[PDB]
């Protein structure tokens, strides 16, 4: 699968963004799709994932209840709705995909998008 993110931008605190990740070559069926983010100077950290075609949804503690991950019917796009954004959410956000189990360690994901920048000003 080839992954491309979009929907990033620069917003004021309290605002929203909607990220999307598109799959090229293949559909997302049979893949775990995860979102990771890298704040400046920090390592990549898990944000959310969707697996089993929607049967399993995972959220990091810091984003639960503010972020929603989903897929479209064709399973060609994965969305990350981000509400109530805080300056702490500022990072490059990466879409990632893998066969197999739904895990939260970036090391186990084989495919990565180039990332979309998300900036939240206070």
- How far are the Cα atoms of 10, 67, 91, 116 from residue 70, in angstroms, in the given order? 22, 10, 20, 18
β-bridge pairing 91-98 and 77-82: unpaired
What DSSP designation does 65 have? T
Strand order in the sheet with 67-71: 2-6, 17-24, 77-82, 67-71
Structural determination approach: X-ray
**Which CATH homologous superfamily contains domain 2-121?**
Immunoglobulins (2.60.40.10)
Q: Where are the domains of the chain?
A: 2-121
What is the C-alpha R_g of the chain? 13
């Amino acid at each position: 699968v080839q992954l491309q993110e979009s929907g990033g931008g620069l917003v004021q605190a309290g605002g929203s963004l909607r990220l999307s990740c598109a799959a090229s070559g293949q559909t997302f069926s049979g893949y775990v799709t995860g979102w990771f983010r890298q704040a400046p100077g920090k390592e990549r950290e898990f944000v959310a994932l969707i697996a089993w075609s929607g049967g399993r949804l995972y959220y990091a503690d810091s984003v639960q209840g503010r972020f929603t991950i989903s897929r479209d019917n064709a399973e060609t796009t994965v969305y990350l709705q981000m509400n109530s954004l805080k300056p702490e959410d500022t990072a490059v956000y990466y879409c990632a995909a893998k066969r197999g189990g739904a895990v939260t360690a970036a090391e186990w994901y084989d495919y990565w998008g180039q990332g979309t920048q998300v900036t939240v000003s206070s």
